[PDB]
Amino acid sequence: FACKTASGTAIPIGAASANVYVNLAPAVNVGQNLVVDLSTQIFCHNDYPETITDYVTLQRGSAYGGVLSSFSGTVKYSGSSYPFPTTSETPRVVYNSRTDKPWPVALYLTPVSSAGGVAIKAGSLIAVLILRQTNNYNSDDFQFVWNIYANNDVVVPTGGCDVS
């Protein structure tokens, strides 16, 4: 794993804690509305395809906390929908080719009111996720934590059509 950000930012891999700076592009859908679309900014490449293949997963100890209170989200981990206050374990994804491959995730929000949502200040906390990986060879595991950081001054529409 040597993931990099589309703005040129490289992440640390030796330590458990890490920070990523991703801008936001909110929009509204028919049922929910996406807040953070990471399926473009974050994508990774592996090393040595012939001997060692990789797998990455996340556990149930994820939260939405920070400035915003806990809501009911929706996550697409290259498949179906899971609640963002995660109560289960994700299916497995595999990396093998040396070329860059996207890592598709999505972050939604359940509407409570038809008016709107709170504003996001430039530079704050969004969500906390934990990831753990396993190899084709070694039987042990190595887990680490990621926290997303805010880079854009945008708002969240919640329900209805936000008009300004």
Partner: antibody, heavy 113, light 105 residues
Framework: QVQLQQSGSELAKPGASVKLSCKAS????????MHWVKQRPGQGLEWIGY????????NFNQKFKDKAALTADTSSNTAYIQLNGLTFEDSAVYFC????????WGQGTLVTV | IQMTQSPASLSASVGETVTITCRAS??????LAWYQQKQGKSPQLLVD???NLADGVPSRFSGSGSGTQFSLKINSVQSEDFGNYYC?????????FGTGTKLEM
């Protein structure tokens, strides 16, 4: 405290459609997901449904593709379900559960053919 | 992924310890739940994944085990359930339940 209630037993002819209603109160019906567990009379348990009351996108299990519908309603606080195709092998009760694992459960429904 | 368990039927005496275990392959991790079934009631949960006694029972129920082997041991039995014990894993999309074990007392 929160409680779960559901309809009683309903019999149906083979090759038909049946609906079972699960009703909730107390906790917020918008926030929390839905689970379904199939219980044959003394032959273990299976895992079937997984529905969101906010929308209509459902995550099935592999053994059935079109055999279930899993329709959710969000205005009358009544979670629904629909079963398509009826045979002798489907005669078992179905449960209602809330996703915090499987804490609060319902009562059951004797569905026979 | 599969779930097979061994003890099935145990004993009919009051006082001694009992052992219930579930066996799984492909190394499921610390995400296995234990809960019991009564013959005429809805099931209720006992312990969370790994070892964590949940709210709802003040009796002596302690779980242990990690890796691929998981077992349950309790020191005293009296006036408890007649039905069955079920084990539930939380790993992937197709959740599967184990078979049945019956305790008499």
């Amino acid at each position: 405290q929160v409680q779960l209630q559901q309809s009683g037993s309903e019999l149906a002819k083979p090759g038909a459609s049946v609906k079972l209603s699960c009703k909730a109160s107390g906790y917020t019906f918008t926030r929390y997901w839905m689970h379904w567990v199939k219980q044959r009379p003394g032959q273990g348990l299976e895992w079937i449904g997984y529905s969101n009351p906010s929308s209509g996108y459902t995550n099935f299990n592999q053994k059935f593709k079109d055999k279930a519908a899993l329709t959710a309603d969000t205005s009358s606080n009544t979670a629904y379900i629909q079963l398509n195709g009826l045979t002798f092998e489907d005669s078992a009760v179905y449960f209602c559960a809330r996703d915090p694992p499987f804490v609060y459960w319902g009562q059951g429904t004797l569905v026979t053919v | 992924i599969q779930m097979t368990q061994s003890p099935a039927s145990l004993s009919a005496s009051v006082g001694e310890t009992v052992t219930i275990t579930c066996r799984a392959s492909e190394n499921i991790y610390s995400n296995l739940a234990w809960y019991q079934q009564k013959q005429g009631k809805s099931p209720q949960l006992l312990v969370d994944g790994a070892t964590n006694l949940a709210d709802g029972v003040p009796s002596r129920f302690s779980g242990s085990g990690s890796g691929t082997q998981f077992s349950l041991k309790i020191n005293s039995v009296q006036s408890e359930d007649f039905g069955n014990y079920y084990c539930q894993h939380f790993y992937g999309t197709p959740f599967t339940f184990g078979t049945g074990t019956k305790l008499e007392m």
